[PDB]
């Protein structure tokens, strides 16, 4: 067990964690717990606090903060220790003490907007960071060399129990022809994984008189950075344009394949990727799993496979009246929580 440690910039305070990524079970977010070792010789600020800060960066508007009295042991605070922290203290000695956080549920997951290729600024998107600083009072200026920072991630893994197969069916009639055009799409399972093939079973019954010119399958990523404002934005992450055509009065059935993966999703900045520590490569933002059903402040992620039917135009209305038909199905793009 490699414990990511970090001494203070001037080698006076050392923060030791147990890990760097935290699993968001929706019902409970695992705790950010660690230990702090202080050197008395260089320790004279007379008090220290360790603060866990969840910030959305775009202008670094914070979304959450929580502080723990790192030293001296707060007389009012008395809570049981964790295995990691107690074992690390036993390893180090009596001049170190623990700090245990408890993230409140219903907070943004560790989602990072994809960094730009030709850019060097700090990554956007929410992120959690533990900052340890010696100070008599919180108002005291926190000198950079007398304070340390260490990033972490709260993230979600794919749902375990598979859900129902998302089958979307639709109909489209027209003034010229009363016969309905029936369309259907499905997906092999209810939850997909990053870089896994997606099967779109596009079936059609085009009894109409117009002509089908093309068919489009997409894996549009709906990312909603829902602040107090309720936004929702679109970004396609995979597309197949099948030239399969159903001329007037034709019945159709074909299965198409689409695997959203980051290989071709680099030039497009801002795509919701997972949480990054410094710059390591990461995958498309795992689908957010909102409880039940408040719109949690922060980023939320979803994916819909949008089957389409490029239908020809013409007739009494000519090309003025668009005859586009589509049908969308929500699925889940998360990571297979390993054993």
């Amino acid at each position, epitope marked *: 067990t490699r414990v990511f440690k970090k001494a203070s910039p001037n080698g006076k305070l050392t923060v030791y964690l147990g890990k760097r990524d935290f699993v968001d079970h929706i019902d409970l977010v695992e705790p950010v717990d660690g230990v702090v070792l202080v050197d008395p010789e260089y320790l004279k600020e007379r008090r220290v606090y360790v603060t866990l800060t969840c910030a959305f960066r775009y202008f670094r508007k914070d979304l959450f903060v929580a502080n723990v009295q790192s030293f001296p042991p707060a007389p009012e605070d008395k809570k049981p220790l964790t295995r990691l922290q107690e074992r690390l203290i036993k390893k180090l000695g009596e001049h170190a003490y623990p700090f245990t956080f408890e993230i409140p549920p219903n907070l943004p997951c560790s989602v990072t907007l994809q960094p730009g290729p030709e850019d060097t600024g700090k990554a956007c998107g929410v992120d959690y960071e533990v900052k340890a600083f010696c100070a008599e009072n919180l108002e005291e200026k926190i000198h950079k060399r007398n304070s340390v920072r260490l990033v972490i991630r709260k993230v979600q893994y794919a749902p375990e129990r598979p859900g129902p197969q998302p089958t979307a069916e639709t109909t489209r009639q027209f003034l010229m022809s009363d016969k309905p055009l029936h369309l259907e799409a499905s997906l092999d399972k209810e939850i997909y994984y*990053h*870089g896994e*093939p997606i099967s779109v079973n596009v079936h059609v019954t085009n009894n109409t008189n117009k002509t089908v010119k093309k068919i489009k399958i997409s894996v549009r990523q709906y990312a909603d950075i829902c602040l107090f404002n309720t936004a929702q934005y679109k970004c396609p992450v995979a597309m197949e344009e099948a030239d399969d055509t159903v001329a007037p009065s034709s019945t159709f059935c074909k299965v198409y394949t689409l695997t959203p*993966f*980051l*290989a071709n999703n680099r030039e497009k900045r801002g795509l919701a990727l997972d949480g990054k520590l410094k710059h390591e490569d*990461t*995958n498309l933002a795992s689908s957010t799993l909102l409880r039940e059903n408040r719109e949690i402040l922060g980023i939320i992620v979803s994916y819909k496979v949008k089957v389409k039917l490029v239908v020809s135009r013409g007739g009494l209305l000519g090309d003025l009246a668009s005859s586009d038909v589509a049908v969308e199905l929500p699925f889940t793009l998360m*990571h297979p929580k390993p054993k």
Partner: antibody
Amino acid sequence: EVQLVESGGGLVQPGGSLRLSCAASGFNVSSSYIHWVRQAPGKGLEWVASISSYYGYTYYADSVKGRFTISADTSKNTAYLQMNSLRAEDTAVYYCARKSMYHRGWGWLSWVYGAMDYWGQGTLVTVSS
Amino acid sequence: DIQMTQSPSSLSASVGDRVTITCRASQSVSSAVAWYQQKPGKAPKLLIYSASSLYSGVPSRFSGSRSGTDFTLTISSLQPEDFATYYCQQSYYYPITFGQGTKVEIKR
């Protein structure tokens, strides 16, 4: 279970080309590194190539830095090591191996390229006029 | 490019003999060395990884140890099946590189 099936090897004169196909089953080519390693007659191993499909990255050995064009298809879930201008030294019993990019922790340890756990049978490839 | 100074080129050992194969990475490796066993004709069966991790299903006799940049693979109780080449392989950097192989013949 994970299984790599290697195919596309046989006699080819010097200056010719083959195309090894490593069909991947039990795992997705996207979520792993696919390596090719050639062992010549009476010699040791010699790493040839490696690819990560999800991030679309490729690494090549010095001996094949341009003559081999590894790629992959996720639809068929297969890797394709082209082998152009196979020279005499290339005579070897090629093998397809891979590294599951799944970190024991969260999703992917994208910076390991670690030990190639699963090795395909590996087929003979000859170069002789 | 990097080179592994695997040695000895070839050693003869008997049943139960304690075999030791050194592998001196020419650079600073970070416990990302892997060891195989390529029986003739067959394919390299991965044994050790990260210079300290025994791959699943491999016999426990194989033991990889790191001494900075000197990775040593030890076979404490040699057994008949372990008469084949062995190639230490660093995975820390690119391109991956193997040792020189070290055949384990029989002694008489």
